[PDB]
Amino acid sequence: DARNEKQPFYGEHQAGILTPQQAAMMLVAFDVLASDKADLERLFRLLTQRFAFLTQGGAAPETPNPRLPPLDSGILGGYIAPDNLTITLSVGHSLFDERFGLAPQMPKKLQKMTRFPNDSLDAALCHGDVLLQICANTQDTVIHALRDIIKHTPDLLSVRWKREGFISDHAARSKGKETPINLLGFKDGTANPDSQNDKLMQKVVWVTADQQEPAWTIGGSYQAVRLIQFRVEFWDRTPLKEQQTIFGRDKQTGAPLGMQHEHDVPDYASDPEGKVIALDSHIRLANPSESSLMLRRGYSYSLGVTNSGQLDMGLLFVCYQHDLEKGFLTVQKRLNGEALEEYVKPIGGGYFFALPGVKDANDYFGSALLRV
Amino acid sequence: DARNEKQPFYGEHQAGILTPQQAAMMLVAFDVLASDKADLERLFRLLTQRFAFLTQGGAAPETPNPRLPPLDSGILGGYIAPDNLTITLSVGHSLFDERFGLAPQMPKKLQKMTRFPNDSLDAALCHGDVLLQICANTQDTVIHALRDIIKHTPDLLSVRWKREGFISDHAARSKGKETPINLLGFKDGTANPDSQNDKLMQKVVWVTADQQEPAWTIGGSYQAVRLIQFRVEFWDRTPLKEQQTIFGRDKQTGAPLGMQHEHDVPDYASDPEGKVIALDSHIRLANPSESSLMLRRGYSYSLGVTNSGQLDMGLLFVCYQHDLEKGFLTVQKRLNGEALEEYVKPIGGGYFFALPGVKDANDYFGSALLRV
């Protein structure tokens, strides 16, 4: 009966951020084709309506006049089940250019993503005016949603880049209780702050009034996205010892090395030379610090074969933070040069600002941004 | 869970052919790196052993000495559930070249796939010495299977091309009783023969003693694979009347136009002009069926974006038949110039011969072939 599960669309915050991870996901970046601020308002209102309909589900729209394109693609049949669908909308640095008059309202820390030292960024997979993160129980529901959105926006959005991902169904069914395993065989996001902790998320994830930010951003979140390829054949031919030294964790339990429990926290002072957990390990380089927390919500991906002839698979890394500079930008800078860099290759993604929630059916996306 | 269901590896025939379609699938073609006929036998013996284990399931091979690479990728955790996994092995025309002295054993109808008029074949996505079709309930299991095979064959196999696909859960759960919907929103394989009719399958799918085939092919099947992109944005802008005219079928029920039930058979003699079912429709051009019958077992796929900037999604078409000339080559020839060609573009795949089954733990793939 999973197909009848509903995630609330409206509220203070968008869904898809704190929501426990569903098994299927798609990241889709678009170029906005809106001529002006008025055309942009038309887009934001239209997306509000579609996402509101798709996430709550219902009878598929009817085509009484068959001389018209069908009102629905029909790929789900006669009923559009909610299937735990969430659709989260975020906006890129580029939307705040000269086209729509939004430059003065730009979030304080929003920037175009520029490369870090280990990156191999492909222009075809970077940035975008808007990004949708579309998640549901099944890939069918996510594809149906995308196509509904595209059908309704041929004059306003143009697909830029897109990638689909997944986590295991067991980890998905645990509703945030059991950690997803990534394609390198290690547990992913073990040390995430508690997303059910109301008060913590207010500090870690959500933009609040006490930050120097334009008021329209309150209730939104900075979103960093990284498309990261893994060298899986090479990884699978690397000793388990070296695998564990790279992550700083026991592979089977996900416990930090020299410890018992998955969510154990190490004391680095006892090991100043990195003899138990290496100075260049992923866990250790990521936190020497009290303020650099973020919420990771990443998915695995598996595609075809790379140009060089290797398996194309890896991670769709997504994280949310009250402040991009204090979170991802600070954490990645700490990680530059880590041992994991031999096995991973960032090739795309970007930085975006996830809008505050649509309060109710009389509100629409970015109403506050577009009014001021 | 569903994870505990198993499909028999051993038999007169390989599994994954008559087997009801599981929800997740991968097609993976490989170049064979074997130096000679002994190397090829070694490969075929090793693949029997891997597939026998993976498909039946068990605890993950453990790594007591961490100085060695892990014996298992670990992506499934500590236990390898069978999860309805089937792995079907097939061989290409190219295997019967000079390398292994098997040229005189080449099945009668086996050939390299050459282009049809509406094809835009991409060489990186065609042919291969061997193809595996790896199907399971979940994508995790399929990717785990692939990585185990690859870990065990670094000197014997090199991945050539790979594509992953799916059907709906809805249809997956019905064990073949409900037809999967494709990404054009039409039911897929409605007119398939009954795969439970052993004697019809002997006529349609299986190679038998009566054909003029090398003895080793008996209990095998010819396999046609086609990677087919859909112009989906364009399709979704197309009148429903035209969509139905193109297929020759009602979109919602799958009934041939003019008729009532999904499985109704039309009277073409009554409508020689094709006023009701068009002469260039998919249903009618395909069937004027008899000895051109074949078993279709295709999957949807959804990847990134095309070089043109459009959604990359479509069909992984797979069909099995006793004679490649009489099935796929005959039917695709009938279909040259069909109205659907405006909306589809085949870009890859190829022809293969699916080996006879491995009858027991003392047998192995291609044993009848690898003698004389």
Specify the DSSP element, H or E, that contains B299: strand B299-305
Which structure tokens are listed for A96? Answer: 């705040």
Q: Do A154 and B238 touch (CB under 8 A)?
A: no
| Nearest by Cα to B165 from B143, B190, B195 | B143
Q: CA-CA distances (angstroms) from residue B80 to A368, B3, B28, B77, B312?
A: 51, 9, 21, 8, 32
Out of A143, A237, A251, name the one closest to residue B302 (CB): A143
> Nearest-CA neighbor of B182 among B229, B134, B248, B221?
B229
The radius of gyration of chain B from alpha carbons, rounded to an integer in Å, stands at 21
B157 in contact with chain A, both atoms CB, cutoff 8 A: no
Q: How far apart are the first and last CA of chain A?
A: 44
Q: Which residues contact A338 (CB under 8 A, 6 or more apart)?
A: A280, A281, A282, A285
Ramachandran angles phi, psi of A187, nearest 5°: -65, 140
Closest CA to A189 of A297, A290, A329: A297
* Residue A353 phi, psi dihedral angles, 5° rounding: -115, 115
3-state helix/strand/coil string of B75-144: CCCCEECCCCCEEEEEEEHHHHCHHHCCHHHCCCCCCCCCCCCCCCCCHHHECCCEEEEEEECCHHHHHH
A171 burial (CB, 10 Å; 0-12 / 13-18 / 19+) is buried
Contact B251/A169, CB-based, under 8 Å?
Answer: no
- If one counts every other C-beta atom within 10 angstroms of the C-beta of residue B210, the result is 9
Q: Sort out which chain B residues have CB atoms less than 8 A from A138's CB and list them.
A: 168-169
Taking the CA of residue B209 and the nearest CA in chain A, the distance in Å comes to: 39
What single string gives the DSSP state of each residue in A191-226?
T---TT-HHHHHHHTS--TTSS--GGGTT-EEEEEE
- Experimental technique used to determine this entry: X-ray
CB–CB contact B75 A185 (8 Å): yes
- Taking the C-alpha atoms of residue B181 and residue B167, their distance in angstroms, rounded to an integer, is 8
- Find chain A residues with C-beta within 8 A of B146's C-beta: 311
Distance between CA atoms of residues A29 and A24, nearest Å: 17
Tell me, in Å, the resolution of the deposited structure: 2.0
Burial class (CB in 10 A: 0-12, 13-18, 19+), B192: middle
Which residue of B305, B308, B347 is the best one to mutate when testing the A interface, meaning the one whose CB has the most A CBs within 10 A? B305
Which residues of B are known binding-site members for protoporphyrin IX?
A: 189-191, 249
- Helix ranges restricted to H, chain A: 37-56, 139-151, 169-173, 198-204, 232-236, 240-247, 282-286, 330-335, 367-371
Place of tokens 């064990």: B175
As given in the structure block, the two tokens for residue B230 are: 């859909």
Q: Where are the beta strands (DSSP E) in B217-293?
A: 221-230
Please tell me the distance in Å from B115's CA to the nearest CA on chain A: 22
**Residue whose C-alpha is closest to residue B304's, from A163, A176, A199, A211:** A163
Tokens of B128: 């291969």
Give the C-alpha distances (Å, rounded to integers) separating A247 from A240, A256, A335, B354.
Answer: 11, 9, 12, 42
State the virtual CA torsion across B186, B190, B192, B194 in degrees, nearest 10.
140
Structure tokens at A283: 């866990």
Look at residue B278 and give its three-state secondary structure: coil
Strand, helix or coil at B175?
A: coil
